């Protein structure tokens, strides 16, 4: 027909790089949104699994979650009720030490004044004694001093027994303070449990987060723009994680493969123009160059596409092809 053009009807649309899609979890397919031949946009849902199980699993965890928030606050009350069972309780024993210590400092000063007087009257006593021995004073004057000294002396150790008695009671109130140091130590023992509870919560929020992933993974969405080259699954099939559900072809992957009789290969060569008419698309002329030639006896020639709507091609399409001789 034309010696400028090798013409052939042995043409196959093929795909170099396709990708297999899978669910990241296992389950029962319940819906198929896309089929063999569909063009799909990155993000589209292709198919969906029954999620009830993964949703139960999540909510089984949300039960146990609120059952650990009904303990966290249960003994956040308990530990803040023992924390005020010692604050108003210690501030009271503190004032009855700051009240005994002032009541004591009142005595220790009246005791000092009395000890002042006793110092003087002791001297008078010594003197008046010596003067009575020598006949230089009446006895009336010396015993007068003597019984004054007796008064001061037993109004003294009245003050000082009234001191060692207000000092043992103080020491007792001060031991009672040490008991509350064992109180807060048992509170901190109760507190080594609160942080081990919100540590069981920290890891539960994580198990939840992971369950919500499994639930989200029940919808198979498309990782890139492409056309569905194969569909391996049907409604009601049980699939496994990572098991192929579709094959997706990157439209840039498409090429035409031509099986050329060796005879009509005369002037054909890598780089040469080529022209493809697929039966599926009468009103479109795909266009390309000869990418490579492999070493009734036909030779496979690979054609790279350079003009025409790639999103329209399907693996397996036939038609007619003209290659330019040189
Ligand atoms: Mg034809």
Residue numbers in the entry: 27 to 321, 343 to 373
Which passages does the manuscript contain on this structure?
Periplasmic adaptor proteins are key components of bacterial tripartite efflux pumps. In all pumps, an essential third component is the periplasmic adaptor (e.g. E. coli AcrA or EmrA), shown by extensive in vivo cross-linking and multidomain docking of the E. coli AcrA-AcrB-TolC RND-dependent pump to establish and stabilise interactions with both TolC and AcrB. Here we present the structure of MFS adaptor EmrA from A. aeolicus, revealing features that appear specific to the MFS efflux pumps.
Native aaEmrA crystallised in space group I4122 with a 78% solvent content and one molecule in the asymmetric unit. The final refined model contains residues 27–321 and 343–373 with an Rwork and Rfree of 20.8 and 24.8, respectively. While this domain organisation is similar to other structurally characterised adaptors, most obviously aaEmrA lacks the membrane proximal (MP) domain identified to date in all 6 RND and ATP-binding cassette (ABC) adaptor crystal structures. Therefore, distinctively for periplasmic adaptors, the β-barrel is proximal to the IM, anchored via its N-terminal TM helix. The aaEmrA anti-parallel, two-stranded, α-helical coiled-coil domain is 168 residues and 127 Å long with 11 heptad repeats per helix. In addition, the heptad repeat pattern is disrupted by a four residue insertion in the N-terminal helix (residues 112–115) and a three residue insertion in the C-terminal helix (residues 210–212), approximately 70 Å from the tip of the structure, and close to the centre of the coiled-coil.
